[PDB]
Amino acid sequence: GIEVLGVRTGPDSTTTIEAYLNPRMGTDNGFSQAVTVATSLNPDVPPKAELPCYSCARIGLPMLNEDMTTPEILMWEAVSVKTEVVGVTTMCNVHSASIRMNGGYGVGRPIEGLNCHMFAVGGEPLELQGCVQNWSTTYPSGVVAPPLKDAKAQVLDPGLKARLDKDGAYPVECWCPDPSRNENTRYFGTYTGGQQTPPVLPFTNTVTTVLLDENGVGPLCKGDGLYLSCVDICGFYSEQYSQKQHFRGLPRYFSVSLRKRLVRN
Amino acid sequence: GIEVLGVRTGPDSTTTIEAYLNPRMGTDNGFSQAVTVATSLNPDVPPKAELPCYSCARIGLPMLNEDMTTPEILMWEAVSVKTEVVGVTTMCNVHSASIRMNGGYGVGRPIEGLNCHMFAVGGEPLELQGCVQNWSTTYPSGVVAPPLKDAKAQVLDPGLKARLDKDGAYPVECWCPDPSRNENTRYFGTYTGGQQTPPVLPFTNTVTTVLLDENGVGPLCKGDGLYLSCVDICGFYSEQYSQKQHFRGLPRYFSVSLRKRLVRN
Amino acid sequence: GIEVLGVRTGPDSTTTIEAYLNPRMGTDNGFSQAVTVATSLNPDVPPKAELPCYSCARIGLPMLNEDMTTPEILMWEAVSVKTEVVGVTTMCNVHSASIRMNGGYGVGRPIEGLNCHMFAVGGEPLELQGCVQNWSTTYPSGVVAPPLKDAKAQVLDPGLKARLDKDGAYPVECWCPDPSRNENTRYFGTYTGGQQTPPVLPFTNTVTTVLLDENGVGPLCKGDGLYLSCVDICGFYSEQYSQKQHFRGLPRYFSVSLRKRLVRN
Amino acid sequence: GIEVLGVRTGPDSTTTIEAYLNPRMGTDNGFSQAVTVATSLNPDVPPKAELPCYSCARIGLPMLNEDMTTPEILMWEAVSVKTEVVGVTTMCNVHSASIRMNGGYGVGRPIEGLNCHMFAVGGEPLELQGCVQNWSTTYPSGVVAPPLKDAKAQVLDPGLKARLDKDGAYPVECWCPDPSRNENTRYFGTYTGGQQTPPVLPFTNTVTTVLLDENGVGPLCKGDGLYLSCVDICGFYSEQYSQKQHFRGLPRYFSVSLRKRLVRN
Amino acid sequence: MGGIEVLGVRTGPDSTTTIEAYLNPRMGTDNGFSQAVTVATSLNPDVPPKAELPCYSCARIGLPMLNEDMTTPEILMWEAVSVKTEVVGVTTMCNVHSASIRMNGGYGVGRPIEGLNCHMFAVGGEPLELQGCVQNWSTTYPSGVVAPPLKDAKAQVLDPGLKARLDKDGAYPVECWCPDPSRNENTRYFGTYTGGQQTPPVLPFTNTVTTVLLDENGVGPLCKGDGLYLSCVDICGFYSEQYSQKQHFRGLPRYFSVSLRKRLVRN
Numbered sequence A, B, C, D: 001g002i003e004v005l006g007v008r009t010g011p012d013s014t015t016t017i018e019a020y021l022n023p024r025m026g027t028d029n030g031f032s033q034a035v036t037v038a039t040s041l042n043p044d045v046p047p048k049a050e051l052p053c054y055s056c057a058r059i060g061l062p063m064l065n066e067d068m069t070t071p072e073i074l075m076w077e078a079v080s081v082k083t084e085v086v087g088v089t090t091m092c093n094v095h096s097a098s099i100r101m102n103g104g105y106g107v108g109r110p111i112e113g114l115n116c117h118m119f120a121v122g123g124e125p126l127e128l129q130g131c132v133q134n135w136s137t138t139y140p141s142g143v144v145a146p147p148l149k150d151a152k153a154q155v156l157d158p159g160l161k162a163r164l165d166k167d168g169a170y171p172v173e174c175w176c177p178d179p180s181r182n183e184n185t186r187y188f189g190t191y192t193g194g195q196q197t198p199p200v201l202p203f204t205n206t207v208t209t210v211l212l213d214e215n216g217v218g219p220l221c222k223g224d225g226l227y228l229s230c231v232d233i234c235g236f237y238s239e240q241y242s243q244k245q246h247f248r249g250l251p252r253y254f255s256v257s258l259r260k261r262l263v264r265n
Numbered sequence E: 001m002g003g004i005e006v007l008g009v010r011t012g013p014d015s016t017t018t019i020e021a022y023l024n025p026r027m028g029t030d031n032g033f034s035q036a037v038t039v040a041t042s043l044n045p046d047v048p049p050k051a052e053l054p055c056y057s058c059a060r061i062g063l064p065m066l067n068e069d070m071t072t073p074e075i076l077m078w079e080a081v082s083v084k085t086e087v088v089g090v091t092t093m094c095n096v097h098s099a100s101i102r103m104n105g106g107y108g109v110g111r112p113i114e115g116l117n118c119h120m121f122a123v124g125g126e127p128l129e130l131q132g133c134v135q136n137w138s139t140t141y142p143s144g145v146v147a148p149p150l151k152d153a154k155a156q157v158l159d160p161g162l163k164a165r166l167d168k169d170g171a172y173p174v175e176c177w178c179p180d181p182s183r184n185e186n187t188r189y190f191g192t193y194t195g196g197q198q199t200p201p202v203l204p205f206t207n208t209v210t211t212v213l214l215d216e217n218g219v220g221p222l223c224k225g226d227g228l229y230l231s232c233v234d235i236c237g238f239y240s241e242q243y244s245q246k247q248h249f250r251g252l253p254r255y256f257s258v259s260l261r262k263r264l265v266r267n
C-alpha cells in the first residue's frame, strides 16, 4: 500500500533503539508454575500460570511529521537488528535442586527439552494465526486465545486472526506468526522438539540481521512506533523431589538501527 | 515441447498468488485415526483414516489468451515462492493428554518422531512414482495406490506412475515425486526418521525459493492453472491412556510470484 | 594420459542420459534376507543374501566417431548429474509388521539405523580398494571379495584392488572407492552409523552436482560407455515377532548431462 | 567516545600477542571438586570449588604515547584472532576410572554432557550482566556474584552489572556477557546442554576470526592493555565408584594480530 | 615463513609434483584395533598397556632433491599447495555380522563400530609440534610410548614445559598429546573430536574435496631438507565383543594426495 521514495540522510537521520523483553512463561521471573497434564482431551484446562506467552513492546520513536497532510511524509525504517538471548550461561547450573543424573549420585539435569525461539521487528504489531493442538482445550481467563468452535482450529482456519497487542497474554501454543500478513514485520522462529533435547544457544555481539526486503526496504514504523516481539522457551526445569516440570524462558535484548525514509502520503 | 520466448513486462504483467493447504493425515483436522499395525506382512490392511496423503490444489490464474490461434501466446511463469508450515508453535503444548515424562510426574511428550516435509510448485500436476515398503499391503478403497503385482513395487518399477490430481487421496507411503518427469514442477522434500526424533521446524517470512531452472525459466502454467502440493508430517501424538499413536500434520502457506511469458503456440 | 582439446558445440553435441539402479541388499526387492551374526570372529560366514552389494551400470552412448584413426577423436564428457534416492516416502510406513513403540501399543518402528549412501559417475568402472572389519570372515560363493591372507586387509593393503564390473556382486563391507585411482570418476559417499539413528534423506529435482575437475574437464567416456555406481542403505527393518533385522535399500535415479569433447587420439 | 582516524602503517606498526588461559572449573587443574546438589531451592549453597568461573587476563602491549598531550595519539587495534581449545585429544581417554559402558564390561565413559565455550577479545574488561537460575542461591565467599534481592535476577535486572576484572572469581552460571555494553570487546559464545551430550570440539591452526566492526574498526586497547576472556566447559567426568560428577574444562590459546590506529586525543 | 624470506613461485616443466601416500592406523596393535581396553578402578594406579593406547600415525616422504649447490644466495623449496585426503575403509562399518553385541535383545544384528571419534590430518615441511596434556596426571604411561613427564596436575591443563615433535609413527599416544597451536608455523593441521558413548560416526568418502594449504600470504608449508611430513589419527569408535562385551578402539587408514610447486627462497 505504501509508495516508498528515497532514504532521508543528514544529521539526526539515523537512530539506534536498545530494549530488552523479560520472558512470560506464566509467572514473572523466568519459569512457568509446575505444568499439569489433562488425562483426556476434554476437559483440558491449562491454568494461565502454566502457559508460556509471547513478549512484546512498542518503542516510541522521535516524532517526524508536524503536518500529516503533505503529499510526502517521513517514516522511521528499521534497517538491521542485533539480538541476543540473555542469561544463556545460567544453564551451566547443575546444583539448584534438579533430578540428579547417574541414578541420584551425579549432578542435576540442566534445563533441557523442547526449545522455541522467535524474534520479530516491525512497524506495527505482529500479526498472528490461531492454531491449537486440541480444539477441546479450555484456555484460561487472562489470556487471549482463538475461538474454538470446531476441530479446524487444529489446522488452518482463516477466521482465526489476531494482533500481538499485549505482553504476556497471547499463549505461544495457540498462536503463530501469520505468513499471509506481516508485510511490515520480519519474524525469525525455530522450534526444536523432543523430550530431553539439548538446548543449543549462541551468545555473541558480532551478528547483525538485515531487515531490508527484496527491494531494499525495511519495516516502516506507523505512528512512529517500533514493535518488538519474541519468545525464548529454553526447555524444562525438573523438580528433584516431585519431578514436576516448569517451562524456563530467558530474556531477549534488541538493538535496532533505523533511518528516515520518505514515502508518498 | 514448448518454445519459450521473452518475458512480457508492463502493467498487470506480474501477480502474487497466496494459498494454504490443510493437511490430509487420514482425517480432516490434523491427525490420523489411531494407527494400527499388522502382525505380519500379509494380511496388512491399513485403513484409509490411518494413511497420510499428499495435499494438492490447482489455483485458477487470470485468463491470458481469449484467442488461442495466434502463432505466440502468453503463459504465467512461476518465478519464486515463499512457503511456511503454519501452527509450528502448537507443538509447545505439553498439557493435552499425552504420555507424561519423568515416570508420569512431568509434562506430556510433545509431538515427535518421523518428519516428512515436501512442497512443490508446478504448471501441471506433480508426477508420482509408485514405491511401497510392503508389496503385500492391501491399500483401502478411497485412496489411489499403485498396483502391487510383485515385489518390484518395493524398489523402482517404471510401470508404476501417477499424477497427484486429487487432494487427500494419494498416500505418502506408496508414492514419491518422480525424478524422471516433473520437467514443469519444482519439488523440495526432506525425511528425518527414527522413533522419538525431535522435530526441527523453522518459521520465518524472510526466505524466498527461486523456481527458475538453469535457463532462467520457471514452471509454465498450462491452462492458466498453478499446481501446489505438499505434505508436512511433524511426528506422532501418543494418547496418555491407550498409548496409541496418531500422525500429526500441519497446514502449509504458499505465496507464489508469477510473470507473463511469451511462448510459441 | 589423454590430451583434452576444445568442447565440440552445435546440433546434437549434447545429450542427457537417464537411468535408475535398483538396490542390491542381498535379495532383489529392496531388503536383505534376515541378517545372522557369528558368535566369534572365526568361523564368520555371512550368506550372500545377507550382504548388501554396490549397484552399477554401463550405459552405451551414441556413436561419436565416423573414424577412430584420425589424430583427434570425440569423447562424451559428463558435465553434471542430478541424482535422487527414489521411494524415500516409503519410510513413512509404520503399519507393515515392525516392532511396536510405546511397549507394543504405538506404531511400528520405521526403517532406521546405519545409513551408507554413495553415487559415482565415471568414464570407466569405479576402482575399489579392499578393506574388511574381520580378516577371518568367509565371504560366500557368488560375491567378489578381496583375498584375506592376513590381518592387513583390516587396514590398507595396496595389493587388494578391483574394478566395480558386476552389479550386485561386490559387497559394500569389503570394498570402498579407491582414492589413489578413479582419475576418470567422481564419487560422493557418506556413512552415518549407530544403532537406531534417524535416516535423513532429501528428495528434490532442483540440485545439480558439477562433475568438472579443477581444469574444467568432466569424466571422459572410454569406449562410449558411461559408468554409474551407488549404494543406498537406509537402515534396518525389524520383524515384529522374531525381532530379526533386514538391510533396507532404495533405488537411485541418475540424469547425466554430457557434451562432445575433442581429444588427441 | 573515541574519534577513530587512519591506520598507522610502516615498520613496527603491527604486532602479534600469544597467550593461554588455564581453566577455572573450581580447582586449579581442569576439574571442579565433586559437584553437590541442593534438595530444594533454599538452602542452595554451592561451594566455590564446585563453581566454574570465567578465565581472564590483561596483556601489556608496547607503550605507544610517551606524550599524551598531542591532539592525536596512537592505540593498538585488535584486527583478528586465532584461538584454539588445547588438550581436546585428552577426551580419547577411556581408561582413567570413569563409569564403564556395556554394564561394567566396556571402556569408561568419556567426558560428556553440557558444553559452554566462550572467548572474548577487547580493549577493556568484558562487561557482564547478572542472571541466575535460582535467586535463592547462596553464592560462596571468594567469588563475585550479583546481589540477589528478588527473583528478577532470574531474568534481566538492569541493576546487576559487573566487569570481568579477576581471573577464576566470576562464576559462569551467574554472569553472561552484557549485549547492551561491550562496544570495545568482541565475544563469541555457544552453549550445548543435555545430560550425556557428545562434546564436538575442533582443533586446527587454519581459522581466523576478524574482530573489525561494521566500520572496519577493531577493539582499541585502552592504556595499551589487551583483554582476553574465556570459558571452556567440555562436560562432566563421572567417578567409577561414587558416580559423582566433576566439571571438566580445557585451556584456551589466543594469537591476536594488532595494528597501530590514530585517534583524536 | 619463520626465518625464511619467501620469493617467487618457480614455474615451467617439472616445477610441480603430486605425492601420494597412505598411513595405516596405530590403535595399539598393527591391524586397525586396540587390544581389549582395560579401565583402572581409581586414578592411581592407572596403568594403560601400550596395546590399548591409540597413537598418531606419521611419515616423512622424501621429495626430489632441489639444491645440489646449497651456497647460492637463493635456493628452491617444495611448497605444499593443497591436499586431497580420504579415510579408507569407511564402508567396512556396514558390517553387522562379525561377532558384535546384538541389538533387539540379542535377536537383531551386531552393533556397528560406534562411540567417540577423533580425526586429524596434518601436512607440513617439518614434524608436527605437540603440546602435552592428559586427563589424569597420575597415569603411568607404558614403556614403548613417548608420553609427557607428569610431575604435577598442571599436565591436565596447559603446562608450557610439555612439548614434543611427532617424530615416530605409532609411539605418541593421542590422549596425552595435541597439536601445539603456539608453534606449527610450517604445518597445517585439521582435527575434530566428537565424543559420547554410542555416538554415530559420520564419515564422508569422496575424491572431489581439496584442502588449500596456503596461509594468509599465499604461502604453503615449505619442505625443509626436501621432506614432506604427513600426520593423522582416525579413531572411528569402539568394537564391542559379543560375549565378553569388552571394547576395542577401531581406526582406519588415511590416504593423502599432496600437490607441491617449487618456491624460490633466500638462502
Ligand SMILES: CO[C@]1(C(=O)O)C[C@H](O)[C@@H](NC(C)=O)[C@H]([C@H](O)[C@H](O)CO)O1
Pocket: A036, A037, A038, A039, A043, A044, A045, A046, A047, B095
Ligand atoms: C486438580 O486441579 C488441576 C490441577 O492439578 O491443578 C486443575 C488443572 O486445570 C488441570 N489441568 C489441566 C491441563 O486440565 C489439572 C489436571 O486435570 C490434573 O492435574 C490431572 O491429574 O487438575
Ligand SMILES: CO[C@]1(C(=O)O)C[C@H](O)[C@@H](NC(C)=O)[C@H]([C@H](O)[C@H](O)CO)O1
Pocket: B036, B037, B038, B039, B043, B044, B045, B046, B047, C095, C096
Ligand atoms: C481389529 O481390526 C484391525 C484394527 O484394529 O483396526 C483392522 C486393521 O485393518 C488392521 N490393521 C492393519 C495395518 O493390518 C488391524 C491389525 O491387524 C491389528 O490391530 C493387529 O493386532 O486390525
Ligand SMILES: CO[C@]1(C(=O)O)C[C@H](O)[C@@H](NC(C)=O)[C@H]([C@H](O)[C@H](O)CO)O1
Pocket: C036, C037, C038, C039, C043, C044, C045, C046, C047, E097
Ligand atoms: C544356522 O546356520 C547359520 C544361519 O543362521 O543361517 C549359517 C550362517 O552362515 C551363520 N552366519 C554367520 C555370519 O556366520 C549363522 C550364525 O552362525 C548363527 O546364526 C549364530 O547363531 O548360522
Ligand SMILES: CO[C@]1(C(=O)O)C[C@H](O)[C@@H](NC(C)=O)[C@H]([C@H](O)[C@H](O)CO)O1
Pocket: A095, D036, D037, D038, D039, D043, D044, D045, D046, D047
Ligand atoms: C554436606 O554438606 C554439603 C556438602 O555435600 O558439601 C554442603 C553443600 O553446600 C551442599 N551443597 C549445596 C549445593 O547446597 C550439600 C548438599 O546440601 C547435600 O550434599 C545434599 O545431599 O551439602
Ligand SMILES: CO[C@]1(C(=O)O)C[C@H](O)[C@@H](NC(C)=O)[C@H]([C@H](O)[C@H](O)CO)O1
Pocket: D095, E038, E039, E040, E041, E045, E046, E047, E048, E049
Ligand atoms: C590384570 O592386570 C591389568 C589388566 O586387566 O590387564 C593390567 C592393566 O594395566 C590394568 N589397566 C589399567 C588401565 O590400569 C588393569 C586394570 O587395573 C584392571 O582390569 C581393573 O579391573 O589390570
